[PDB]
Amino acid sequence: SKVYKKTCPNAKLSIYLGKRDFVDHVEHVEPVDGVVLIDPEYLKDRKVFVTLTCAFRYGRDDLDLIGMSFRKDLYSLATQVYPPETKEPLTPLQEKLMKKLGAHAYPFCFKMGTNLPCSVTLQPGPDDTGKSCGVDFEVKAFCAENLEEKIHKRNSVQLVIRKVQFAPANLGVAPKTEITRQFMLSDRPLHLEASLDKEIYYHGEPINVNVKINNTTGKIVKKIKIIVEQVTDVVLFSLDKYVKTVCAEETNDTVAANSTLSKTFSVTPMLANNREKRGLALDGKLKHEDTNLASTTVIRPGMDKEVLGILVSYKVKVHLVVARGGILGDLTSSDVAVELPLTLMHPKPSDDIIIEEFARQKL
């Protein structure tokens, strides 16, 4: 099995995890189990703690500037890993890590609660008003007298894991994501209908959009555009709003006068296919290869949406370019469009130790 590690500055302490990403199903979240390797001689009479913090941050350009900033811990777990105490059910991978690292390896396990927001990072672009912001999950291991002590970077390691969202296997009874509207052009109807075949789609997966157009007008639809739109709402500090196209399939398809058209478009929204990544809600840093578009934010009734920090949702839109009589220079055209909600979630996990450095690779 593959595991990931990180050593603190003075190399007097390192931490190990079985994976970089942890899936949030909905009823439960995957445990964050691992071990820390300690230096007994160095750690003369000190305790070793391991904390997991979910934090919302706003401001601070790229890495570090000066301007405005806001920070809020929405959730945090802390544990004394060394010296140990309650001897409890070690996980298989923990078993191995200890058989490998030796006797100076002590286990720790974090079982996050449910309803917490998933990883979301956003960096402002040329057409945006807000500032950088995000929801992070940081894992720190350090040496100290107690959790009250100010923590110094020299003898502590920090790790940023991702908590990604999967759509419950306990989901069904899907209504039907479809829509049909009428648009009057010179007193005559232009019906445009769209529908999705599924309830939830997953990153890297094809989305089939059914389009039915009943054009009873004397005008001509010269273009049909299909876009996947991402709507990001920062709901904590500053109420910033981002509405971005994360996929656009512009086609040839035309619909003459007194004509109908039934067709199925198929598009796959992918952070990779996007040139401009600024302004988009991601689940990690832009410079990283494993980073994807943020998942649809699962919002539940009775809960304050602000505790989520950032709200991410998607839409599929169908745009028709209609010309005042689709011909000649009458390029004095109009646009008509319909939209449908789109829930985009992570695929889902499936059922000798090779140690790798934790740092995510830059593509």
Coordinates of C-alpha atoms in Angstrom, one line a residue:
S1 CA 0.0 0.0 0.0
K2 CA 1.0 3.6 -0.7
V3 CA 1.3 6.1 2.2
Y4 CA 2.3 9.7 2.5
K5 CA 4.7 11.5 5.0
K6 CA 5.9 14.8 6.0
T7 CA 8.8 15.7 8.3
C8 CA 9.0 18.9 10.3
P9 CA 11.8 21.5 9.9
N10 CA 14.3 20.2 12.4
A11 CA 13.5 16.6 11.3
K12 CA 12.7 15.7 14.9
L13 CA 9.1 14.6 14.0
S14 CA 7.2 13.4 11.0
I15 CA 3.6 12.4 10.2
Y16 CA 2.1 9.6 8.0
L17 CA -1.3 9.3 6.4
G18 CA -2.7 6.5 4.2
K19 CA -4.2 8.9 1.6
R20 CA -4.3 12.6 0.8
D21 CA -8.1 12.8 0.1
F22 CA -11.0 11.7 2.3
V23 CA -14.5 11.2 1.1
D24 CA -17.5 12.6 2.6
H25 CA -20.4 10.2 1.9
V26 CA -23.3 11.9 3.6
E27 CA -24.2 9.7 6.5
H28 CA -20.5 9.4 7.4
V29 CA -17.0 10.5 6.6
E30 CA -13.9 8.4 6.0
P31 CA -11.6 8.4 9.0
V32 CA -8.3 10.2 8.9
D33 CA -6.0 7.6 10.4
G34 CA -2.2 7.6 10.5
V35 CA 0.8 7.7 12.8
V36 CA 3.5 10.1 13.9
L37 CA 7.2 9.1 14.3
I38 CA 8.8 10.6 17.3
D39 CA 12.3 11.3 18.6
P40 CA 12.3 10.3 22.3
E41 CA 15.7 11.9 23.1
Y42 CA 14.7 15.2 21.5
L43 CA 11.1 15.1 22.9
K44 CA 12.5 15.4 26.4
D45 CA 9.4 15.3 28.6
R46 CA 7.1 16.9 26.0
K47 CA 3.8 15.6 24.6
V48 CA 3.0 15.2 20.9
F49 CA -0.4 16.4 19.7
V50 CA -2.2 16.0 16.4
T51 CA -4.9 18.4 15.3
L52 CA -7.4 18.6 12.4
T53 CA -8.9 22.0 11.6
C54 CA -11.6 23.0 9.1
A55 CA -11.1 26.7 8.5
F56 CA -12.6 29.4 6.3
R57 CA -10.2 32.1 5.1
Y58 CA -10.8 35.3 3.2
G59 CA -8.3 37.6 1.7
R60 CA -4.5 37.3 1.4
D61 CA -3.5 37.3 -2.3
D62 CA -1.7 34.3 -3.8
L63 CA 0.5 33.5 -0.8
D64 CA 1.0 36.6 1.5
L65 CA 0.3 40.3 1.0
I66 CA -0.9 42.7 3.7
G67 CA -4.4 43.9 2.9
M68 CA -7.6 42.6 4.5
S69 CA -8.2 39.2 6.0
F70 CA -10.8 37.2 7.9
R71 CA -10.4 33.7 9.4
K72 CA -12.7 31.4 11.2
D73 CA -12.3 27.9 12.6
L74 CA -15.6 26.1 11.9
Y75 CA -14.4 22.8 13.3
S76 CA -11.3 21.4 15.1
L77 CA -10.3 18.2 16.7
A78 CA -7.1 17.8 18.8
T79 CA -5.6 14.8 20.4
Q80 CA -2.6 13.8 22.5
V81 CA -0.9 11.1 20.6
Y82 CA 2.1 10.7 22.8
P83 CA 2.4 9.6 25.4
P84 CA -0.5 7.3 24.6
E85 CA -3.3 6.1 26.9
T86 CA -6.5 4.4 25.7
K87 CA -5.2 1.4 23.7
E88 CA -7.8 1.1 20.9
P89 CA -8.6 -0.8 17.7
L90 CA -5.7 0.1 15.4
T91 CA -6.6 0.1 11.6
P92 CA -4.9 -2.3 9.2
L93 CA -2.8 0.4 7.7
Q94 CA -1.8 1.7 11.1
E95 CA -0.8 -1.9 12.0
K96 CA 1.6 -1.9 9.1
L97 CA 3.0 1.7 9.6
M98 CA 4.0 0.7 13.1
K99 CA 5.5 -2.7 12.0
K100 CA 7.5 -0.6 9.6
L101 CA 8.4 2.7 11.3
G102 CA 9.3 0.9 14.5
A103 CA 8.5 1.6 18.1
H104 CA 8.6 5.3 18.0
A105 CA 5.5 5.5 15.8
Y106 CA 2.2 6.4 17.6
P107 CA -1.2 6.1 16.1
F108 CA -3.9 8.8 15.9
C109 CA -7.3 8.7 14.2
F110 CA -9.8 11.4 13.3
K111 CA -13.4 10.6 12.7
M112 CA -14.9 13.9 11.5
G113 CA -18.6 14.6 12.0
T114 CA -21.1 15.0 9.2
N115 CA -22.5 18.1 7.7
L116 CA -19.1 19.9 7.5
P117 CA -18.2 21.7 4.3
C118 CA -16.0 20.1 1.8
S119 CA -12.7 21.5 0.4
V120 CA -13.2 24.7 -1.6
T121 CA -10.5 27.1 -2.9
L122 CA -11.1 30.2 -5.1
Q123 CA -8.7 32.7 -6.6
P124 CA -10.1 36.1 -7.9
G125 CA -9.8 36.9 -11.6
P126 CA -9.8 40.0 -13.9
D127 CA -13.6 40.1 -14.0
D128 CA -14.2 39.5 -10.3
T129 CA -14.7 41.9 -7.4
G130 CA -13.9 39.7 -4.4
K131 CA -10.7 38.3 -2.8
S132 CA -9.2 34.9 -2.5
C133 CA -11.0 32.6 -0.1
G134 CA -11.5 29.0 0.8
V135 CA -12.5 26.2 3.2
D136 CA -9.4 24.2 4.3
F137 CA -8.8 21.0 6.3
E138 CA -5.4 21.2 8.0
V139 CA -3.6 18.4 9.9
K140 CA -0.8 19.5 12.3
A141 CA 1.5 17.4 14.5
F142 CA 3.7 19.2 17.0
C143 CA 5.6 18.9 20.3
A144 CA 4.4 21.0 23.3
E145 CA 3.5 21.1 27.0
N146 CA -0.2 21.6 26.2
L147 CA -2.6 22.7 23.5
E148 CA -2.6 26.2 25.1
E149 CA 1.0 26.8 24.1
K150 CA 1.7 29.0 21.1
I151 CA 2.9 26.7 18.3
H152 CA 6.3 27.3 16.7
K153 CA 6.9 26.1 13.2
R154 CA 10.4 24.6 13.9
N155 CA 9.0 21.5 15.7
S156 CA 5.7 21.0 14.0
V157 CA 4.4 19.7 10.6
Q158 CA 1.4 20.9 8.7
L159 CA -0.6 19.0 6.1
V160 CA -3.6 20.0 4.0
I161 CA -5.9 17.1 3.2
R162 CA -9.0 17.3 1.0
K163 CA -12.5 16.3 2.0
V164 CA -14.4 15.6 -1.2
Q165 CA -18.1 15.0 -1.6
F166 CA -19.8 11.9 -2.8
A167 CA -23.6 11.5 -3.5
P168 CA -25.3 9.0 -1.1
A169 CA -25.7 5.4 -2.3
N170 CA -28.9 6.0 -0.3
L171 CA -30.4 8.2 -2.9
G172 CA -33.3 7.7 -5.3
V173 CA -36.9 8.6 -6.1
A174 CA -35.6 11.1 -8.7
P175 CA -38.4 13.5 -10.0
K176 CA -37.2 14.5 -13.4
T177 CA -34.8 17.3 -14.3
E178 CA -36.5 18.8 -17.3
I179 CA -37.9 22.1 -18.5
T180 CA -39.8 23.6 -21.3
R181 CA -40.6 27.2 -22.0
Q182 CA -42.1 29.3 -24.8
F183 CA -40.6 32.5 -26.2
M184 CA -42.7 34.8 -28.5
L185 CA -41.1 36.1 -31.7
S186 CA -43.5 38.3 -33.6
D187 CA -46.5 36.7 -31.9
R188 CA -45.4 33.2 -32.7
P189 CA -44.1 30.5 -30.3
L190 CA -40.5 29.1 -30.1
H191 CA -40.6 26.2 -27.7
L192 CA -37.3 25.1 -26.2
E193 CA -37.2 22.0 -24.0
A194 CA -34.2 20.5 -22.1
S195 CA -33.7 17.5 -19.8
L196 CA -31.1 15.5 -18.0
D197 CA -31.0 11.7 -17.8
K198 CA -29.7 11.5 -14.3
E199 CA -29.9 13.0 -10.8
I200 CA -26.2 13.2 -9.9
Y201 CA -23.2 13.4 -12.2
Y202 CA -19.6 12.9 -11.3
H203 CA -16.3 14.7 -12.2
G204 CA -14.8 13.4 -15.4
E205 CA -18.2 11.9 -16.4
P206 CA -20.3 12.7 -19.6
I207 CA -23.5 14.8 -19.1
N208 CA -26.1 14.1 -21.7
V209 CA -28.5 17.0 -22.4
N210 CA -31.7 16.3 -24.3
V211 CA -32.9 19.3 -26.4
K212 CA -36.3 19.6 -28.1
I213 CA -37.0 22.7 -30.1
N214 CA -40.4 23.3 -31.7
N215 CA -39.9 26.5 -33.7
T216 CA -43.3 27.6 -35.1
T217 CA -42.0 31.1 -35.8
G218 CA -40.8 32.5 -39.1
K219 CA -37.4 33.1 -37.7
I220 CA -34.4 30.8 -37.7
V221 CA -32.3 29.5 -34.8
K222 CA -28.7 29.6 -36.2
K223 CA -26.9 28.4 -33.2
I224 CA -27.4 26.2 -30.2
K225 CA -25.0 26.5 -27.3
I226 CA -24.7 24.2 -24.3
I227 CA -22.9 25.5 -21.2
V228 CA -22.2 24.1 -17.8
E229 CA -22.3 27.1 -15.4
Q230 CA -20.7 27.2 -11.9
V231 CA -22.3 29.5 -9.3
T232 CA -20.2 30.2 -6.3
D233 CA -21.6 32.1 -3.3
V234 CA -19.3 33.2 -0.5
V235 CA -21.7 33.5 2.4
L236 CA -19.5 34.2 5.4
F237 CA -17.4 37.4 5.5
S238 CA -18.1 39.1 2.1
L239 CA -21.1 38.1 0.0
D240 CA -19.1 37.6 -3.2
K241 CA -20.8 36.1 -6.2
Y242 CA -19.2 34.2 -9.1
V243 CA -21.1 32.8 -12.1
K244 CA -18.7 31.1 -14.6
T245 CA -18.8 28.9 -17.6
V246 CA -16.9 25.7 -17.0
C247 CA -17.9 24.0 -20.3
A248 CA -19.2 25.3 -23.6
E249 CA -20.3 23.2 -26.6
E250 CA -21.1 25.5 -29.4
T251 CA -22.5 23.6 -32.4
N252 CA -23.7 23.9 -36.0
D253 CA -27.3 22.8 -35.5
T254 CA -29.9 25.1 -37.0
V255 CA -33.7 25.1 -36.8
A256 CA -35.5 26.5 -39.8
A257 CA -38.9 28.1 -39.8
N258 CA -41.9 25.9 -38.9
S259 CA -39.4 23.2 -38.0
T260 CA -38.6 21.0 -35.0
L261 CA -35.4 19.5 -33.7
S262 CA -34.8 16.7 -31.2
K263 CA -31.1 16.1 -30.3
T264 CA -28.9 15.0 -27.5
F265 CA -25.7 16.9 -26.6
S266 CA -23.0 15.3 -24.5
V267 CA -20.5 17.4 -22.6
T268 CA -18.0 16.8 -19.8
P269 CA -17.1 19.7 -17.5
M270 CA -13.4 19.4 -16.5
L271 CA -11.1 21.8 -14.8
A272 CA -8.4 20.6 -17.2
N273 CA -10.4 21.9 -20.2
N274 CA -10.5 25.4 -18.7
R275 CA -7.9 28.0 -19.7
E276 CA -8.9 30.5 -17.1
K277 CA -9.0 28.9 -13.7
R278 CA -9.4 32.1 -11.7
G279 CA -12.9 32.9 -10.5
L280 CA -13.7 29.1 -10.3
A281 CA -14.5 27.2 -7.2
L282 CA -11.9 24.4 -6.9
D283 CA -11.3 21.7 -4.3
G284 CA -7.6 22.6 -4.1
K285 CA -4.9 24.9 -5.4
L286 CA -4.7 25.8 -9.1
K287 CA -1.1 24.7 -9.5
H288 CA -2.0 21.2 -8.5
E289 CA -2.6 18.3 -10.8
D290 CA -5.2 16.4 -8.7
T291 CA -7.3 19.5 -8.2
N292 CA -10.9 19.4 -9.6
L293 CA -13.9 21.7 -9.8
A294 CA -15.5 22.0 -6.4
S295 CA -18.5 19.6 -5.8
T296 CA -22.1 20.7 -5.5
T297 CA -22.4 21.9 -1.8
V298 CA -24.9 19.6 0.0
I299 CA -27.2 22.0 1.8
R300 CA -29.6 20.8 4.4
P301 CA -32.8 22.4 5.9
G302 CA -32.6 23.8 9.4
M303 CA -28.9 24.7 9.1
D304 CA -27.4 28.1 8.7
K305 CA -25.8 28.1 5.3
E306 CA -23.1 30.5 6.6
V307 CA -21.4 27.7 8.5
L308 CA -20.5 26.3 5.1
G309 CA -18.5 29.4 4.2
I310 CA -18.7 28.8 0.4
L311 CA -21.8 27.6 -1.6
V312 CA -21.2 25.9 -4.9
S313 CA -23.9 24.8 -7.3
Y314 CA -24.1 24.1 -11.0
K315 CA -26.5 24.6 -14.0
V316 CA -26.8 23.4 -17.5
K317 CA -27.9 26.1 -19.9
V318 CA -29.2 25.9 -23.5
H319 CA -28.8 29.1 -25.6
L320 CA -30.4 29.6 -29.0
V321 CA -29.2 32.4 -31.2
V322 CA -32.4 33.5 -33.1
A323 CA -32.1 35.9 -36.1
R324 CA -34.8 38.4 -36.9
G325 CA -35.3 36.1 -39.8
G326 CA -32.2 34.0 -39.8
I327 CA -30.7 35.2 -43.0
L328 CA -28.6 37.8 -44.9
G329 CA -27.3 40.7 -42.8
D330 CA -30.3 40.6 -40.4
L331 CA -27.7 39.6 -37.9
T332 CA -29.7 41.7 -35.5
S333 CA -30.3 38.4 -33.6
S334 CA -31.7 37.6 -30.2
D335 CA -31.0 35.0 -27.6
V336 CA -33.4 32.6 -25.7
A337 CA -32.4 30.2 -23.0
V338 CA -33.5 27.7 -20.4
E339 CA -31.6 26.2 -17.5
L340 CA -31.6 23.2 -15.3
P341 CA -29.9 22.5 -11.9
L342 CA -26.9 20.2 -12.0
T343 CA -25.6 18.2 -9.1
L344 CA -21.9 17.4 -9.6
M345 CA -20.1 15.1 -7.0
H346 CA -17.0 13.0 -6.7
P347 CA -17.0 9.5 -8.4
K348 CA -16.8 7.4 -5.2
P349 CA -14.2 5.2 -3.5
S350 CA -14.1 1.5 -4.3
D351 CA -13.6 -1.6 -2.1
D352 CA 4.5 -3.8 1.0
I353 CA 4.3 -0.2 2.1
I354 CA 5.6 2.3 -0.4
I355 CA 6.4 5.6 1.3
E356 CA 5.8 8.8 -0.8
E357 CA 6.3 12.4 0.1
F358 CA 2.9 14.1 0.8
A359 CA 3.5 17.3 -1.2
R360 CA 1.0 17.2 -4.1
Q361 CA 2.7 17.3 -7.5
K362 CA 2.5 20.4 -9.7
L363 CA 1.6 19.7 -13.3

